[PDB]
Design a protein around this motif. Structure first.
Motif, PDB file in Angstrom:
ATOM      1  N   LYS E  38      18.583 -39.765   2.302  1.00 24.28           N
ATOM      2  CA  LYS E  38      19.681 -39.894   3.240  1.00 24.28           C
ATOM      3  C   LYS E  38      20.488 -38.607   3.232  1.00 24.28           C
ATOM      4  O   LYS E  38      20.832 -38.084   2.167  1.00 24.28           O
ATOM      5  CB  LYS E  38      20.543 -41.093   2.888  1.00 24.28           C
ATOM      6  CG  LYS E  38      19.879 -42.341   3.372  1.00 24.28           C
ATOM      7  CD  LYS E  38      20.832 -43.457   3.524  1.00 24.28           C
ATOM      8  CE  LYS E  38      20.170 -44.592   4.255  1.00 24.28           C
ATOM      9  NZ  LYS E  38      21.143 -45.669   4.446  1.00 24.28           N
ATOM     10  N   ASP E  43      19.278 -39.080   8.500  1.00 23.22           N
ATOM     11  CA  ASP E  43      20.434 -39.832   8.962  1.00 23.22           C
ATOM     12  C   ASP E  43      21.632 -38.986   9.357  1.00 23.22           C
ATOM     13  O   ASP E  43      22.484 -39.478  10.106  1.00 23.22           O
ATOM     14  CB  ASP E  43      20.876 -40.857   7.903  1.00 23.22           C
ATOM     15  CG  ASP E  43      19.734 -41.728   7.421  1.00 23.22           C
ATOM     16  OD1 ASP E  43      19.469 -42.765   8.073  1.00 23.22           O
ATOM     17  OD2 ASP E  43      19.095 -41.373   6.408  1.00 23.22           O
ATOM     18  N   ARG E  46      24.342 -37.749   3.711  1.00 27.57           N
ATOM     19  CA  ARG E  46      23.441 -37.635   2.587  1.00 27.57           C
ATOM     20  C   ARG E  46      23.764 -38.747   1.608  1.00 27.57           C
ATOM     21  O   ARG E  46      24.938 -39.026   1.340  1.00 27.57           O
ATOM     22  CB  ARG E  46      23.539 -36.281   1.909  1.00 27.57           C
ATOM     23  CG  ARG E  46      23.154 -35.159   2.820  1.00 27.57           C
ATOM     24  CD  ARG E  46      23.146 -33.942   2.005  1.00 27.57           C
ATOM     25  NE  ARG E  46      22.142 -34.179   0.983  1.00 27.57           N
ATOM     26  CZ  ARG E  46      20.852 -33.964   1.201  1.00 27.57           C
ATOM     27  NH1 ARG E  46      20.439 -33.315   2.279  1.00 27.57           N
ATOM     28  NH2 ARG E  46      19.958 -34.378   0.310  1.00 27.57           N
ATOM     29  N   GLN E  49      19.139 -43.616  -2.212  1.00 31.54           N
ATOM     30  CA  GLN E  49      18.917 -45.054  -2.284  1.00 31.54           C
ATOM     31  C   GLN E  49      18.221 -45.363  -3.602  1.00 31.54           C
ATOM     32  O   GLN E  49      17.218 -44.727  -3.939  1.00 31.54           O
ATOM     33  CB  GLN E  49      18.095 -45.526  -1.084  1.00 31.54           C
ATOM     34  CG  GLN E  49      17.825 -47.020  -0.989  1.00 31.54           C
ATOM     35  CD  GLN E  49      16.484 -47.294  -0.325  1.00 31.54           C
ATOM     36  OE1 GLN E  49      15.451 -46.837  -0.806  1.00 31.54           O
ATOM     37  NE2 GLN E  49      16.499 -47.989   0.812  1.00 31.54           N
ATOM     38  N   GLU E  81      22.651 -46.581  -2.737  1.00 31.73           N
ATOM     39  CA  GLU E  81      22.826 -45.210  -2.301  1.00 31.73           C
ATOM     40  C   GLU E  81      23.915 -44.541  -3.115  1.00 31.73           C
ATOM     41  O   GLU E  81      24.991 -45.101  -3.336  1.00 31.73           O
ATOM     42  CB  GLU E  81      23.160 -45.102  -0.815  1.00 31.73           C
ATOM     43  CG  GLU E  81      21.965 -45.319   0.053  1.00 31.73           C
ATOM     44  CD  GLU E  81      22.265 -45.182   1.519  1.00 31.73           C
ATOM     45  OE1 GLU E  81      23.216 -44.468   1.908  1.00 31.73           O
ATOM     46  OE2 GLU E  81      21.513 -45.792   2.297  1.00 31.73           O
ATOM     47  N   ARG E  83      26.089 -41.354  -2.626  1.00 29.01           N
ATOM     48  CA  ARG E  83      26.336 -40.414  -1.544  1.00 29.01           C
ATOM     49  C   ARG E  83      26.348 -38.982  -2.062  1.00 29.01           C
ATOM     50  O   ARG E  83      27.082 -38.633  -2.989  1.00 29.01           O
ATOM     51  CB  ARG E  83      27.639 -40.739  -0.823  1.00 29.01           C
ATOM     52  CG  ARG E  83      27.694 -42.165  -0.306  1.00 29.01           C
ATOM     53  CD  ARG E  83      26.807 -42.300   0.906  1.00 29.01           C
ATOM     54  NE  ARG E  83      27.290 -41.512   2.025  1.00 29.01           N
ATOM     55  CZ  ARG E  83      28.082 -41.957   2.987  1.00 29.01           C
ATOM     56  NH1 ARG E  83      28.584 -43.181   2.959  1.00 29.01           N
ATOM     57  NH2 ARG E  83      28.376 -41.153   4.000  1.00 29.01           N
TER      58      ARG E  83
END
Lengths: 56, 114, 122, 38, 209
Positions: E38, E43, E46, E49, E81, E83
Motif C-alpha cells: 500500500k 493505492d 502507503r 498489510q 496495515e 501506515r
RNA sequence: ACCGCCCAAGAGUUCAUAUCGACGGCGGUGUUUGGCACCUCGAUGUCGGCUCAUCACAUCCUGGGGCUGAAGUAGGUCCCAAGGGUAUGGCUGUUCGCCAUUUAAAGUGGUACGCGAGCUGGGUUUAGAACGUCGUGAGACAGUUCGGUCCCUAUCUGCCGU
RNA sequence: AAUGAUGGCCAGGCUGUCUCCACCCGAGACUCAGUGAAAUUGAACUCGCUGUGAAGAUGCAGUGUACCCGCGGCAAGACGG
C-alpha cells in the motif's frame, strides 16, 4: 404518561413488521426407517444417531 | 498460563523457613536508613497465610512497644531477603486474626514444640 | 490518613493526649493525608501543667495512622491506632520536648530532623 | 493608558493618531499621555 | 519501528535484583507478517498489510485460500496495515521478526477491553452518591438532573450518559518499557494492557515522543 | 439602578486624568427598588438545601502586555487575552451574614431569581391548643412559641448503545 | 420530692450516618410457552438555528442538516395526565 394523539393505522403494521415468524425448513432425514426427525433429536420412534434407544 | 509459568518459575524464593498461622515470624526487609545498608528486626507471628507461590504471603505479627506497625509481606519478593525463626506457634485454623487484640499477660500461645 | 477531627493520640511529652484533624496542608482538597503530612488541627485536652491549655490550636507532623506504611516491595508496616505528633506554628517541630512511639521514616528529611535525633523508634 | 470616547491632545509633544477608524492618543513627552477613541 | 500487538496472555509482577517490583502485561505475538503493498503505487497511500498467527488447514477458504494462495502463505490471525512512515514501507508476503522494538522506551496498547455490558454510570464517569437515609425516595443510584427548562429545552449531544462501555478497542500509548523475550515472544511491561486478559491490544512505539 | 464615560474647581508636596475630584455634561446595559395592566384564574405547585451542569466576559490566578510617585519585592493604572482552575468547619430555616482556619485563588453574571413525570420540606398561606396586646363579645394581630398525609406501567421530539 | 412513647442543650459507647465505596445471597426486571387490562384520544407524511407574531413556534420567512424499520435504557420538551 400517555400518548397525546391517536396513532395512524399504517404505523401499526410496521411495528409489527419484524415480529414476522421464521420457518424451520431444515428437516433431517433418518437412515433407519427414514421417518423425518429433527436433526440431533431422537425420532418420534425414539431414534437418534440411528439406533433404537429407550423403547416405546 | 504456560506463558509466565516459565517466566516466574524462576522468581519465587529459594529457602523459606518454617511457620504456621501463628508461628513466630520476622521478615528482614532491607529498608532505607542513612547511607549504608543493614538488617533490622520485625519479629512476629503469622495470623494469615497465602499459599499462592511467588505472590503469596507468610505473616509476621510483632508487638511495637504497645502499638505495632503491621506488615503484609511478600515471601517471594526479594525485598524479603530472608526469614530467621525464633519459635513456631501452635495453631488450629488458617488465619490468626486473634493474634492482635490478644495482649500482655495472656498474649502468648505455647510452643507447638512437636 | 488524618481527616476532619481524626481521633488523635499523642506521641510526645507535652501532656496533651488530644488532637483532631481540621485542615490538611500543602494543597486544596487534600483528602487522605498522613505519614509525613502536616495539617491544621486543634487541641482538645492537655496534662494539668502542660505547655498547652484547653483550646490551643496547631497543625500536625504525623507518625501513625490506622493505615500503616508501604515499603519498597509493596509491603507495608501498618499502624494499629491513630496516634500522632503535633507541630509548632512558627518553629514547626512538635510543640513538646519528649516524643515516644512509632513515627515514619517518611518524615525523615532534616526538617523534622529535630525528632530524628534521639527517638526510641524510627 | 486612557480609553474613552473622549480623546484629545494634552501637551506639546503628542500625536493623536488615527490608527485606522477609532481616534487615539499618544505621547512623545510623558508616559501618561496615551489614549484611543471610545 | 512499527508497533507489535499480542494476545493478552495475562500478567505478572516481575521480580528483580534490588527490591524492584514490576507487575507487567503478559502478551503473545508470533512472527508477524506484512502481506501487501500500500502506497502511491497501487493505492496512492502507503501501508503494510499484516497478518500474524495460524489457521487450521481445512478452514483457509479458497478465495482467502487464494488470498493466501495468491499470497502463498500460512494463515495468520489477522492482516493489519502499518501506515508507511517514509521509512515504513512493505510489500506482500513477509514473515516478520520482533527486533523493531530494539529500544522504543514506550509502546502502545489498543484493543477490546474487559467485557462489561451495561456498566453503571457510577463506574463509567465517577459520579456521586446521594445519601442513603433521612428520607431518600428510591434514588440511591440515579443520575439525577440532566438538563434545563423551557429555555433551550433539548438535550445537548454528547452528554455523558450511563450505558455500555469498555470491552472494546483501547489505545494505550507512550507506555514505559520494562522487558521482553524475543526468544519467547512475550511482552512484560510495568503497567498492564487493557481489555480482557488474553486480548490483543495495539502496542506501538510512543507517538507522544 | 448600576456601570461607563465628557467637561475641568480642585487636589493632590510637583502634576486637574502617578492616584483622586467641585459643579455641571453625554452614554450603555437591562441585574436592584420601581410604573402599566396585553396573555394564564373549566389549575402555569412557594423559600432553601442535594446530584449535574452550561455559556458571556465589563479578567480572580495563571498567560501576555503596557505603563506607572512600578529599586528586588510588593503595588496603582491602561490595552490583549475566555485554554485550564477555582477550600474545609462552628453559629442560626436561612439565602444573606458572621466567624475559625487554609490556599495561586476562593471572579461576576443567564439560563421560568436552572433544575420536584430526579430527592427532601426545616421556612412561608388550613383544621388543635397557648402568651402579650386589641375590642362587651363573636374574633383579629402583617406580634411571638409546640404538633401536623407529596400521584404518575414513557405514545412522539430528544439523547445514550445496540 | 416522684413522674413523662414531653420541650431545649452537653458528656460516655458505638458503629458503613459521611470522605468513598467493594464484594456476596435472595425476590423482580430480560428470552420461550399460555392467558390477557387503564388512564388517554380535531386531524397529522410529527428536525435545529436566528427573526416575526393575542407579545416564550414541529406546522410562519430565511436559512443547516439529515438512507427504511426495530430492540434495551434516560427523563429536558410536547404550557404532559
Amino acid at each position: 404518561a400517555v400518548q397525546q394523539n391517536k396513532p395512524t393505522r399504517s404505523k401499526r403494521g410496521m411495528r409489527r413488521s419484524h415480529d414476522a415468524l421464521t420457518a424451520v425448513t431444515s428437516l433431517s432425514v433418518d437412515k433407519t426407517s427414514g421417518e423425518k426427525h429433527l436433526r440431533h433429536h431422537i425420532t418420534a420412534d425414539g431414534y437418534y444417531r440411528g439406533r433404537k434407544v429407550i423403547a416405546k | 498460563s504456560n506463558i509466565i509459568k516459565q517466566l516466574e518459575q524462576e522468581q519465587m524464593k529459594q529457602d523459606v523457613p518454617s511457620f504456621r498461622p501463628g508461628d513466630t515470624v520476622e521478615v528482614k526487609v532491607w529498608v532505607v536508613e542513612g547511607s549504608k545498608k543493614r538488617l533490622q528486626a520485625f519479629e512476629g507471628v503469622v495470623i494469615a497465610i497465602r499459599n499462592r507461590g511467588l505472590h503469596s504471603a507468610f505473616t509476621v505479627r510483632k508487638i511495637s512497644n504497645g502499638e505495632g506497625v503491621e506488615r503484609v509481606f511478600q515471601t517471594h519478593s526479594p525485598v524479603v531477603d530472608s526469614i530467621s525463626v525464633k519459635r513456631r506457634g501452635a495453631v488450629r485454623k488458617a488465619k490468626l486474626y486473634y493474634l492482635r487484640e490478644r495482649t500482655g499477660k495472656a498474649a502468648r500461645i505455647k510452643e507447638r514444640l512437636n | 490518613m488524618i481527616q476532619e477531627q481524626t481521633m488523635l493520640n499523642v506521641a510526645d511529652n507535652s501532656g496533651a493526649r488530644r488532637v483532631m484533624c481540621i485542615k490538611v496542608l500543602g494543597g486544596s482538597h487534600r483528602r487522605y493525608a498522613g505519614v509525613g503530612d502536616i495539617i491544621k488541627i486543634t487541641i482538645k485536652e492537655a496534662i494539668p501543667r502542660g505547655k498547652v491549655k484547653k483550646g490551643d490550636v496547631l497543625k500536625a507532623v504525623v507518625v501513625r495512622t490506622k493505615k500503616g506504611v508501604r515499603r519498597p516491595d509493596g509491603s507495608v508496616i501498618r499502624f494499629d491506632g491513630n496516634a500522632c505528633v503535633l507541630l509548632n506554628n512558627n518553629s514547626e517541630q512538635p510543640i513538646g520536648t519528649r516524643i515516644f512511639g512509632p513515627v515514619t521514616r517518611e518524615l525523615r528529611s532534616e526538617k523534622f530532623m529535630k525528632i530524628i535525633s534521639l527517638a526510641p523508634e524510627v | 493608558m486612557k480609553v474613552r470616547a473622549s480623546v484629545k491632545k494634552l501637551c506639546r509633544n503628542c500625536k493623536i493618531v488615527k490608527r485606522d477608524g477609532v481616534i487615539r492618543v499618544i505621547c512623545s513627552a510623558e508616559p501618561k499621555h496615551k489614549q484611543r477613541q471610545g | 519501528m512499527i508497533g507489535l500487538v499480542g494476545k493478552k496472555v495475562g500478567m505478572t509482577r516481575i521480580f528483580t535484583e534490588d527490591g524492584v517490583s514490576i507487575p507487567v502485561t503478559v502478551i503473545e505475538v508470533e512472527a508477524n507478517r506484512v502481506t501487501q503493498v500500500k502506497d502511491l503505487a497501487n493505492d496512492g497511500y502507503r501501508a503494510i498489510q499484516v497478518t500474524t498467527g495460524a489457521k487450521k488447514a481445512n478452514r483457509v477458504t479458497k478465495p482467502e485460500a487464494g488470498h493466501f494462495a495468491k499470497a502463498g502463505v500460512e494463515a495468520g490471525r489477522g492482516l493489519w496495515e502499518f501506515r508507511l512512515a517514509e521509512g515504513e514501507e512493505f510489500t506482500v508476503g513477509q514473515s516478520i521478526s520482533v527486533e523493531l522494538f530494539a529500544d522504543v522506551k514506550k509502546v502502545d496498547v489498543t484493543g477490546t477491553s474487559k467485557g462489561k455490558g451495561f456498566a453503571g454510570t457510577v463506574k463509567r464517569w465517577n459520579f456521586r452518591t446521594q445519601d442513603a437515609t433521612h428520607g431518600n425516595s428510591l434514588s440511591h443510584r440515579v443520575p439525577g438532573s440532566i438538563g434545563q427548562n423551557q429555555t433551550p429545552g433539548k438535550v445537548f449531544k454528547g452528554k455523558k450518559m450511563a450505558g455500555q462501555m469498555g470491552n472494546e478497542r483501547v489505545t494505550v500509548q507512550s507506555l514505559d518499557v520494562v522487558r521482553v523475550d524475543a526468544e519467547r515472544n512475550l511482552l512484560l511491561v510495568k503497567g498492564a494492557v487493557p481489555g480482557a486478559t488474553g486480548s490483543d491490544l495495539i502496542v506501538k512505539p510512543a507517538v507522544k515522543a
